[PDB]
Amino acid sequence: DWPVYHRIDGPIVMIGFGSIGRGTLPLIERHFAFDRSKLVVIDPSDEARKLAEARGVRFIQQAVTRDNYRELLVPLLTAGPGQGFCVNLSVDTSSLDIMELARENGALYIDTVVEPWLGFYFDPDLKPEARSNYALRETVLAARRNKPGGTTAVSCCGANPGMVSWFVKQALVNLAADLGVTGEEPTTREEWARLAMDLGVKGIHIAARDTQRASFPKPFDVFVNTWSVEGFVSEGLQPAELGWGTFERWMPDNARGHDSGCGAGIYLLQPGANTRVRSWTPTAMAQYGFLVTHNESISIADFLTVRDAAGQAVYRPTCHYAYHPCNDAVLSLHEMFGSGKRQSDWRILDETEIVDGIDELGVLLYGHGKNAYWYGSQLSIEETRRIAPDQNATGLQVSSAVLAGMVWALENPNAGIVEADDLDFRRCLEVQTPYLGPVVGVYTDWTPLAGRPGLFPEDIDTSDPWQFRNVLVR
Amino acid sequence: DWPVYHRIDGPIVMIGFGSIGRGTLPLIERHFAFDRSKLVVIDPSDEARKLAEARGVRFIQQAVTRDNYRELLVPLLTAGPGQGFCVNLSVDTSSLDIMELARENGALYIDTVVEPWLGFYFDPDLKPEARSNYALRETVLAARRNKPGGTTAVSCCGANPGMVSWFVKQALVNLAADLGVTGEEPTTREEWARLAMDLGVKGIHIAARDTQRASFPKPFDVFVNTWSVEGFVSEGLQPAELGWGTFERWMPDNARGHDSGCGAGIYLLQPGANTRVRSWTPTAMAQYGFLVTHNESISIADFLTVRDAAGQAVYRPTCHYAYHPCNDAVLSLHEMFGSGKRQSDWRILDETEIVDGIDELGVLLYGHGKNAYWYGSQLSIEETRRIAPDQNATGLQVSSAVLAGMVWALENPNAGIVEADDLDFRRCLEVQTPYLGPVVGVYTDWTPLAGRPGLFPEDIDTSDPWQFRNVLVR
Ligand SMILES: NC(=O)c1ccc[n+]([C@@H]2O[C@H](COP(=O)([O-])OP(=O)(O)OC[C@H]3O[C@@H](n4cnc5c(N)ncnc54)[C@H](O)[C@@H]3O)[C@@H](O)[C@H]2O)c1
Ligand SMILES: NC(=O)c1ccc[n+]([C@@H]2O[C@H](COP(=O)([O-])OP(=O)(O)OC[C@H]3O[C@@H](n4cnc5c(N)ncnc54)[C@H](O)[C@@H]3O)[C@@H](O)[C@H]2O)c1
Ligand SMILES: N=C(N)NCCCCN
Ligand SMILES: N=C(N)NCCCCN
């Protein structure tokens, strides 16, 4: 009695079958009507092939590359009888090139990252600015300007980026009620941005604490994570990056901006997974997060930008990731950065290996009259196993967001290139919420200046606790 | 058939019965002749009392304080018939005051730290320099200038500080031998300092990797360590501190020297357990260490100082701790600094709780013709259980160093106030080595500039890989 939202008439082309593909396929089978034979999975690994064969789904063992993607994908996307859906959950592939190929062939598209073709993340000829997620996102915004409207393609619709955009909207609604701000619920981007401004939201952390842990301890010289190791390391070695709020009075000496684009970002000349920030979640209370670049750090700040008539930004929230991954991933980062090179091996924790834990993932809106408000999911591994197969709690928050994005795309298939900020947050959360466990809002009086200054002189701004100057760990 | 080294002809007063007192008591019983009733343990803890009652030893459940130490310890240490031994393995007590009391009453003395009376480490009216181990050590040096000679008192004779001073001497001898330099090894402090100078030793890391882990995972809001939690947190919140070599050409903007004293130190205006350095051990290979202040960072640099006729330092090595504690302690530090406060609870891992692991503890001499040489112990928990009770591998390296210092003090009882750098390193290692497991010397071509620069600008000195500029994580 799981809801079947729609029938999909055309081919369903899943690119990538790692941790998220494995968790998303069963949700697609559960929630859409289609002949199983219309699915096709593309992945270069033998591991993926054997799992796909165990599920009786068509499999092509190929890496999608710049050289082959047109000849490989166009026949799959256009096999008919109707509109196909490209579900892209891969690494090492260009999200922009594949999305544009889907659109010109009339196929819907969804992904969870603006990924580049293999070679980009470690290309020594690129300036740091060009390796930023701001720069990658700007290629998507340029593609939209060049071809407005047309077939829907949903960029960056996982848990974060993705779901957390919908949490920001729900949190703004809750804050407005709790603070007594009158007005109808916003229905346009400008109205959302004005509501954040009117509420006095100085900034937003994507504030996450993963407490899953395995039945075995972290092995030496093995990177351990609850989702893509390759993907986490790639974003962790990109510059630290944030949407930059109009309220900020200070940035570090090694911070840089952008000469062009939407104007909402800065980045630091240091890797994000070795950059710490002071943050807070309900279960962690005060904790360090890593300032890992994410698409939504830019997209949320951009979405909530208010401009004057000259086009100058007069309000924008700071927005960035404050990630505390699982303990073995924390150790894995200490080992990787401490050695100066990637470990020899890695592994992604399977639900059969996880003893207990939750993936606490939400948004921390701060600077308003009630100081700080966290809104999000506290999904446990135990609940995950009861309600969805083949994934851990991290995976289910992502796969269920892809499901919601797919439902929205089928119901709005002529919307052009869109981000999660552009979707109907209420419909998406209606689809996703059965998979999120406890979803709660919590206020706190904690601030980044709690307990400070201490035994040593610190470079703090005592006038405003939430300044990045107080959040960033030097 | 354990060797019995000496008769102790007077009371043995053990102050403190935590992890190190528990590991040292069986070695004292094993290796010294004395009537059982001569030994008494002083500790305020109920847990300690119960264990001592179980070991059949006299126990006085009392905190030693500035107000009571004279009335308590003078009668106990002078009970007769001859010279007693104060074995000080406590926290929250003044090493200097207890040492001076023991000496004025003719009792031998040993400790593993220059500890202050309770209140000092977190005193808000103290400048950071006054909280430094350099400053604490200078109180011992002044005591020795005021009362030269007299009864032997051994300051800071644990594993590190303590044993590592003997490892430095052995490593210097080994480096010379490996180069083909033959001849009488040094006998005076000047000759040792000139050996380091002549061999081109630029600096020394106390380079350690603890791999012990427990049968339960790290509990939330519990600090876990393999030795004193209180003591590790105390030194971890003291300023980062190092003996400062003559070859260094850069120091950070928040580094400071000292107006007075032996001249060998700098400190940083930040806590050492939240300061990382690039270092290396044989089992870890390249790793982060924490730059936690330690007595030997200053005492080894001081000992190996060569001065000119005017008294100015012409050569001195850099010397500092590069500590990678057990994984649960790494997580404990991330938790403590990330929350801004000490955890609600703590625990020290017992040998019965430890599944496997070693305490790899040695000295990394660098800058000489063979680049870098690590010399030290790789004692495993499995070997520990075979050879000594009531402790883990970390404890046994410490307790066996205390044993060695006790033998040396009984053999050289008229030497006055001394540090581990002043003892006969061969005799001390002769006593200690049965408890050290594999003791090895390993060369490596690794330097702090391995793999650097990466994809971000870095301030590095490529002319001199081992400069602190390149070691310090910035
Ligand atoms: N919330 C979010 O937005 C979010 C969360 C998790 C993951 N992600 C992203 O989702 C993607 C997948 O994550 P995951 O955990 O499943 O990763 P994963 O590492 O588990 O799996 C990635 C898969 O991609 C395949 N692959 C590699 N090269 C390929 C190519 N050229 N063509 C096709 N497939 C290729 C691999 O063989 C592998 O099976 C990653 O890009 C990741 O960063 C997003
Ligand atoms: N290699 C080294 O040099 C080295 C290594 C380990 C420990 N240390 C030092 O040795 C000492 C003991 O370490 P540990 O692991 O045994 O610590 P621990 O925390 O296990 O035990 C400390 C004990 O001191 C006792 N104590 C507290 N206040 C006291 C007082 N006023 N009088 C007497 N006893 C008191 C406590 O009850 C506790 O039992 C610490 O100072 C530590 O820093 C040195
Ligand atoms: N989300 C933004 N930053 N802008 C609005 C984009 C709307 C695309 N239809
Ligand atoms: N170890 C030194 N730094 N100096 C020599 C001290 C000698 C004490 N008898």
Numbering used by the authors:
A (entry chain A), B (entry chain B): 3 to 476
What does the paper say about this structure?
It catalyzes the conversion of two molecules of putrescine (PUT; 1,4-diaminobutane) into one molecule of sym-homospermidine [HSP; bis(4-aminobutyl)amine] as the main reaction along with several side reactions. Bacterial HSS is NAD+-dependent, active at neutral to basic pH with an optimum at pH ∼8.8, and shows increased activity in the presence of 50 mM potassium ion. BvHSS forms a dimer, with each subunit containing a boot-shaped substrate-binding pocket between an NAD(P)-binding Rossmann-like domain and an HSS-like domain. The cofactor NAD+ is bound as a prosthetic group in the binding pocket with its nicotinamide ring being part of the active site.
Krossa and coworkers identified three binding sites for the amino groups of reaction components within the substrate-binding pocket. Assuming the amino groups of the reaction components to be protonated at neutral to slightly basic pH, the ‘innermost’ N atoms of PUT (N1) and of HSP (N01) mainly bind via a salt bridge to Glu210 and, in addition, via a hydrogen bond to Asn162 at the ‘inner amino site’. Following a similar approach to probe the role of BvHSS residue Glu210, the E210A, E210Q and E210K variants were examined and were found to be inactive.
